[PDB]
């Protein structure tokens, strides 16, 4: 329990939310903190910080200041990035400052990836 701004989402007994907003999310053993915002998304044994996530599935992953849209994260670490209609796995995948749409990352030198695999949703 914490400074959640939960509308109608689920946050399990061992999940946590702090100064963050939740809209019909399903947060299972997961952490939604520091102005994170979720909308109709599944978090499972995962952590999210200052990110805005919509219709996503985030399993055993860590997410920081990222914009998840209609995408899946599975065993990854992702920061300062945007993902649209994607499925991203490793495990131990690492992503920094990327923009990714249906399995294709932008060719910008700002995008870093290590130990990862990308796919279309």
UniProtKB/TrEMBL annotation:
Coiled coil: none annotated. Disulfide bonds join 4-17, 25-38, 56-68, 93-116, 98-111. It comes from Choristoneura fumiferana. Keywords: Signal. SUPFAM superfamilies: An insect antifreeze protein (SSF51177). Pfam families: CfAFP. It comes from the Eukaryota. This is Antifreeze protein isoform 501. InterPro entries: Antifreeze_CF, Antifreeze_sf.
